[PDB]
Amino acid sequence: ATPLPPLRLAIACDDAGVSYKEALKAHLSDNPLVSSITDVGVTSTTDKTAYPHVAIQAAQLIKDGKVDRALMICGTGLGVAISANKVPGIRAVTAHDTFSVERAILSNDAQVLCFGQRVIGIELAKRLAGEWLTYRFDQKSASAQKVQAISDYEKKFVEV
Amino acid sequence: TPLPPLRLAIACDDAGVSYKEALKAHLSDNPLVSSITDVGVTSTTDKTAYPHVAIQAAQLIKDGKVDRALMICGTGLGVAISANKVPGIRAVTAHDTFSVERAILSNDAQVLCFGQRVIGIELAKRLAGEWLTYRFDQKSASAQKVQAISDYEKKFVEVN
């Protein structure tokens, strides 16, 4: 069935990302490269919970080994990416083109992909999310040494 | 100029050099820029990894030396991830006019990143120009969300 192992995903959004979230969730449920989707929420546009909370929660699922990656939607995709990058060991991007989406994995080993619902169209979002799943980072690559410099910097800090 | 000029840092890896030179030239003529500090690299020969230049530029903001940084690499992703690891720094990759505006007005993001291999130079110049014309409102509702990120960052302490 699948040449590549399926990934476990978290999906998450703020009130501005609800509709693309549901369409993307349905689209990805049909994909054999996805073995599970955990919905962090929000579930409704009335829910005014701020983007940092949701982004940090979804990133914590990755940190705890409960999912492999997270797909995050807000107005622009910016706030959730900033917030997820604040979690030690988590690398997050907003990527709105096919080349960036490939490099987000192959160069940056980024576990979190963020979209701006108000900025890109749904079919492009679906296409990008689908392609994202087909790339797997090489830990022995030249790119991994650069990622290691980010991790080296993160070693400056401890949680108190 | 009706708005105060800003001090800028600019940075790139080897993949971002020609766009950095072009942007620097374009911005040096802009009355909204009071100074530009170029942290490098200055040649495609210089293989210094993107995290070092991004962290150096981000530290200039942290240390009150510049107001904002413009960073260029192949995709703009690696430098944004790197910059977001620096405490109190918020960085975006933003390749459209709506996202650039929201980066400032919603996210108070001091760092803007471009992918030389992903966007065209005229669009990059136009976006960097528009970026300077927005100023974050510290009294806004968006400031509460920004403070939420800042509060998370206080869980970590720099030991090294």
Numbering used by the authors:
A (entry chain A): 3 to 162
B (entry chain B): 4 to 163
Please, what does the article write about this entry?
Attempts to solve the structure by molecular replacement with other RpiBs such as that from Clostridium thermocellum yielded clear rotation and translation solutions, yet poor refinement statistics (R of 0.39 and Rfree 0.47). Therefore the partial molecular replacement solution was combined with the SAD phases and yielded a clearly interpretable electron density map (FOM 0.53 prior to density modification) into which Buccaneer built both molecules in the asymmetric unit end-to-end in less than one minute. Interestingly, the active site contains electron density consistent with an oxidized cysteine residue (Cys76) in both protomers. Although the exact oxidation state of the cysteine residue was not determined, the electron density maps were most consistent with two conformations of the sulfenic state rather than sulfinic or sulfonic acid. The oxidized nature of Cys76 may imply that this residue, thought to be the catalytic base, is highly reactive. An iodide ion resides in the same place as this chloride ion in both protomers of the asymmetric unit in the iodide-phased structure.
Two types of ribose-5-phosphate isomerases exist, RpiA and RpiB, which share little structural homology and have distinct active sites and mechanisms of action. Although RpiB occurs predominantly in bacteria, here we report crystal structures of a putative RpiB from the pathogenic fungus Coccidioides immitis. The C. immitis RpiB contains the canonical open (α,β) Rossman fold, a common fold for proteins that bind nucleotides or nucleotide-like molecules.
